[PDB]
């Protein structure tokens, strides 16, 4: 399945443009995919524990928000 390859090179380009990056080595795209997957694993792992300890099968936005704040990366807009 390997849906990490669905994070295409242009999508990684635009994230770098918003990051203010002018020239991108062609080796960046594989390194960025590894970075993203390592991050996104950690958040979902934490979120699923809030879901299960609330005795739910559905992971909720506040499960994600608590996982993010637990990681020090507080996200506003989805809930208090």
């Amino acid at each position: 399945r390997d849906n990490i390859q669905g994070i295409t090179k242009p999508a990684i380009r635009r994230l770098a443009r918003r990051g203010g990056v002018k020239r991108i080595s062609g080796l960046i795209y594989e390194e960025t995919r590894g970075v993203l997957k390592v991050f996104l694993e950690n958040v979902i792992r934490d979120a699923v524990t809030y879901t299960e300890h609330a005795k739910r099968k559905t992971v909720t936005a506040m499960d994600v928000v608590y996982a993010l704040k637990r990681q020090g990366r507080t996200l506003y807009g989805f809930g208090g």
């Binding site: 950690n42 792992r45 934490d46 524990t49 809030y50 300890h53 609330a54 637990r70 990681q71």
Partner: protein, 644 residues
């Protein structure tokens, strides 16, 4: 015992390339070069990337043997420039530049080469007119030959020049007639088939490994072995002497290698190289006083803390006891609410903290207060005495259990150790699991919201009385440096201490004694060179190429009767036998393989060109200045000892 039985180590000082003496110009050679018969004199120069050798063809050994290096610099405080052009470069500022491209046989810094040639002719006493024989790389590049011959004709103006291959001059000096010439030099390793004194250079092969690469690879290895930091300055000139003095070719590599770091006899397989080093009561009483006072004060703090805990926790026990008494006295409806004064729901909970308080104190008008404080000390003293009695009673039972039931008693301690080992391994695994990911705690906390001394003691008793137990079983031995491969690799059979300046600043060679030469035989495995090994190259030539070649006759058998070894980098122990036994398996059974070493395999390549220099075969190959001015510097007279 295992190391204390060994003698003090034999250790060899580092060796490096160094300046040794002044060589005044050898004017006697210049006079003899004029007295010798007409046309029977030449300057013979061997372009060794490790050593330029130069001298007179009519002489049996060269006058010079000089590294192809220059060092030119401005002495800023004195304004004069200096330049040096051999071992006069102290290989002391060492602005050294080398004529050759590193790891190749080809000259590339012509300013350096021109300064080396300048040094040569000065030291030969040139007062200028003399023919030059110059050795050359196999398949040497045309541009490189053009540049060298331009220097010889335009700058130095010499009358005639001839180029020949150093390995083929060496073969001729050893009565070579037909054979396989195997050269290993500084730059490279070559296999040349020679048929009827003529080299079949279209069938020559190069390995791109040689004595330079061995010194470079040995340096990479020593830097990795001591990656923690070796405090001596590791240099390629030092590893070049290490590869010479200590390396040798293995007669059977894998069976020798796999046991090389095995602990017995390692002090024989290991050789130790010493880098240079330098090494260097009232305060002792004062330190001991401070240590005594600070130690006592800490014990006073612990005793005060414990004695403080004694009164508090005993009164908390009395506090819990009075809660129990009131709980037991008052109506049953009061039980939980009264025990909630002890913040606990039931005596089944309160007994837990009661026991922990009892354990802790067990483990640990003002005259009325002082007596009450004295009572707390006395109460713990009784608990201490009862604890010691309980331990002594348990010891007395274990004594009789050991004396009567020893086999069962020891089997208990073995199984207890196994349990304690499993408990420690579970605890060690837990200590690896704990903090493997910080959020482990915060994840689990939401579920709520919404051995060392024992193992040692068991081991010590088994060492005391289980005659089948032994120290190597203990976890202590399982962590001893004496049981570690990386200590043997880096430091050998002796214990090591970083306090000794003498025992730091020494390198232990070990596996690289044999691993370094074997890159010739296993290049892609040992150093990634991605080329066929020497035995596979020589086997390809003898077995695949020469029998197919149409003009040749008696192949392989004519070439196979003389596999000839040339160049300094062949001088390893067992190099010849290793090459023989490798080829022997590739050849038809009983084939008359001989492998032979050159005499004096370094200088012998020069002696061949000196002997050859003025023969009629050579003088038919000489190019004159007036030919060069028309033909240019790339053009050469093809001859049996030179390139096409």
């Amino acid at each position: 015992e295992p190391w204390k039985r060994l003698p003090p180590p034999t250790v060899y000082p580092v060796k490096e390339a160094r300046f040794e003496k002044y060589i005044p110009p050898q004017l006697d050679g210049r006079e003899r070069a004029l007295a010798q018969p007409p046309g029977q004199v030449a300057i013979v120069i061997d372009n060794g990337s490790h050593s330029v050798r130069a001298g007179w063809n009519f002489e049996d050994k060269p006058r010079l043997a000089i590294p192809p290096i220059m060092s030119k610099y401005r002495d800023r405080k004195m304004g004069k420039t200096f330049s040096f052009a051999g071992s006069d470069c102290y290989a002391a500022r060492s602005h050294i530049r080398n004529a050759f491209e590193a790891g190749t046989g080809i000259v590339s810094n012509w300013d350096v080469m021109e300064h080396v040639l300048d040094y040569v002719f000065v030291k030969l006493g040139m007062n200028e007119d003399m023919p030059i024989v110059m050795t050359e790389a196999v398949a040497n590049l045309p541009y490189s030959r053009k540049s060298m011959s331009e220097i010889i004709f335009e700058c130095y103006g010499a009358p005639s020049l001839v180029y020949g291959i150093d390995s083929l001059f060496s073969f001729r000096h050893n009565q070579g007639q037909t054979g396989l010439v195997v050269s290993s030099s500084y730059s490279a390793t070559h296999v040349i088939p020679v048929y009827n004194r003529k080299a079949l250079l279209s069938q020559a092969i190069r390995l791109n490994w040689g004595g330079w690469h061995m010194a470079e690879y040995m340096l990479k290895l020593l830097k990795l072995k001591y990656y923690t930091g070796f405090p001596g300055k590791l240099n390629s000139s030092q590893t070049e002497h290490m590869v010479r003095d200590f390396c040798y070719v293995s007669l059977d590599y894998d069976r020798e290698l796999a046991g090389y770091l095995d602990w017995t006899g390692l002090e024989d397989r290991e050789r130790i190289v010493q880098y240079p080093y330098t090494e260097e009561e009232e305060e002792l009483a004062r330190i001991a006083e401070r240590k005594k006072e600070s130690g006592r004060r800490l014990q006073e703090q612990a005793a005060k803390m414990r004695l403080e805990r004694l009164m508090k926790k005993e009164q908390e026990l009395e506090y819990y006891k009075d809660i129990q008494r009131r709980m037991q006295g008052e109506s049953k409806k009061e039980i939980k609410r009264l025990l909630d004064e002890a913040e606990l729901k039931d005596e089944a909970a309160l007994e837990r903290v009661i026991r922990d308080l009892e354990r802790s104190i067990k483990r640990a008008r003002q005259q009325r207060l002082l007596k009450s404080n004295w009572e707390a000390r006395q109460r713990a003293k009784a608990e201490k005495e009862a604890e010691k009695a309980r331990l002594a009673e348990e010891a007395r039972l274990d004594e009789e259990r050991r004396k009567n039931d020893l086999e069962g008693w020891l089997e208990e301690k073995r199984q207890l150790r196994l349990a304690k080992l499993n408990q420690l391994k579970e605890r060690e695994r837990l200590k690896a699991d704990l903090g493997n990911r910080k959020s482990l705690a915060s994840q689990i906390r939401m579920k709520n919201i919404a051995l060392e001394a024992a193992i040692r003691s068991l081991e010590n008793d088994l060492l005391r009385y289980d005659k089948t137990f032994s120290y190597d079983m203990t976890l202590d031995a399982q962590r001893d440096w004496s049981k570690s491969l990386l200590h043997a690799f880096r430091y050998g059979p002796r214990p090591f201490d970083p306090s000794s300046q003498a025992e730091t600043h020494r390198v232990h060679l070990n596996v690289e004694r044999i691993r370094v030469p074997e890159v010739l035989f296993q290049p892609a495995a040992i150093a990634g060179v991605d080329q066929a090994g020497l035995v596979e190259i020589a086997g390809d030539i003898l077995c695949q190429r020469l029998p197919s070649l149409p003009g040749i006759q008696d192949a392989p058998d004519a070439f196979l009767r003389d596999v000839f070894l040339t160049g300094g980098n062949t001088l390893f122990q067992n190099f010849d036998e290793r090459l023989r036994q490798g080829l022997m398996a590739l050849l038809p059974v009983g084939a008359p393989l001989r492998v032979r070493r050159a005499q004096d395999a370094i200088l012998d390549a020069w002696r061949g060109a000196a002997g050859w220099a003025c023969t009629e075969e050579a003088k038919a190959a000489w190019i004159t200045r007036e030919e060069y001015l028309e033909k240019g510097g790339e053009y050469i007279k093809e001859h049996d000892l030179g390139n096409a």
